[PDB]
Ligand binder design. Structure first.
Ligand SMILES: Nc1n[nH]c2ccc(-c3ccc(NS(=O)(=O)c4cccc(Cl)c4)cc3)cc12
Length: 282
């Protein structure tokens, strides 16, 4: 019943985001057509999705129902026709849209970075890999509260496996990807840590397009792109230290980007370090 949303009570307000396969929009859900209603975010598959995209969409909805964390977008229910995913409305939107138009100090960024690590440490503990950990998928509720907002590429990791074998896709976030994902198509929990390293780089660069990983890696050059990127990352080459980033944080990022996945810190490890770093800055 509270998980049941009828189309008849859903009024589209605006668009919230769009990926290759899905679409997120803001709706007002008012069953009493008065004012005691609520704002919800409604995710739907776009027209033209393959059978494997539809079966994965069922798994995604099941995944979000399973996840309960202060730093994970709350599942609210479904809208059945095809199926639409109903979630809570996280008002300030994504950090990719938020940061270039806002004033957020270093201590606040480090708080966001710590909360991402908290939700991510819970995700891994629930035996799931995210695979799309970037600033566009982290949502801001208020100046003190972030939520991992999209699980489109999330996957369960079987019984005693430390990695998940992935399929070659031209749609995948290549510049957020660890070398083991690009060369061997292997996604470990450690591969998400690498993406967190890239996410932290994005926050410290205010999600400025001119300083983006895409632009910096293009400059660093001097599937052919993926091939040259793997050599770059194996040579030991990394993203530059952002002007604003203190050396201890750049170290944290570099540890997150250790070439060998086993050597990278765990999300459970990152939470205290970041809490300290955030506490130190003010
Ligand atoms: N403001 C919000 N309240 N609740 C939400 C749930 C998801 C989202 C959301 C989450 C992720 C994105 N990033 S995105 O790159 O646009 C994207 C990637 C994959 C699939 C979709 Cl539909 C969108 C954009 C919006 C926003 C809100």
């Amino acid at each position: 019943d509270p998980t049941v949303f009828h189309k008849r009570y859903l009024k589209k307000i605006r668009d919230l985001g769009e990926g290759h396969f899905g679409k997120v929009s803001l709706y007002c859900y008012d069953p009493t057509n008065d004012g005691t209603g609520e704002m919800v975010a409604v995710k739907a598959l776009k027209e033209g999705c393959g059978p494997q995209l539809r079966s994965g969409w069922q798994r995604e909805i099941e995944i979000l129902r399973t996840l309960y964390h202060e730093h994970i977008v709350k599942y609210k229910g479904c809208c059945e026709d095809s199926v639409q995913l109903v979630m809570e409305y996280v008002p300030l939107g994504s950090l990719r849209d938020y940061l270039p138009r806002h004033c957020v100090g270093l201590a606040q960024l480090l708080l966001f970075a710590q909360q991402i690590c908290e939700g991510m440490a819970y995700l891994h503990a629930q035996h799931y890999i995210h695979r799309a950990l970037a600033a566009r998928n982290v949502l801001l509720d208020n100046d003190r509260l972030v939520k991992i907002g999209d699980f489109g590429l999330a996957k369960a990791v079987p019984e005693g496996h430390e990695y998940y074998r992935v399929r070659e896709d031209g749609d995948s976030p290549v510049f957020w990807y660890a070398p083991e994902c690009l060369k061997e198509c292997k996604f470990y929990y450690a591969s998400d840590v690498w993406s967190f390293g890239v996410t932290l780089y994005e926050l410290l660069t205010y999600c400025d397009s001119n300083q983006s990983p895409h632009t910096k890696f293009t400059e660093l050059i001097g599937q052919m792109t993926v091939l040259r990127l793997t050599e770059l990352l194996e040579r030991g080459e990394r993203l530059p230290r952002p002007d604003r980033c203190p050396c201890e944080i750049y170290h944290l990022m570099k540890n997150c980007w250790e070439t060998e996945a086993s050597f990278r810190p765990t999300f459970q490890n990152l939470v205290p370090i970041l809490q300290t770093a955030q506490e130190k800055y003010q």
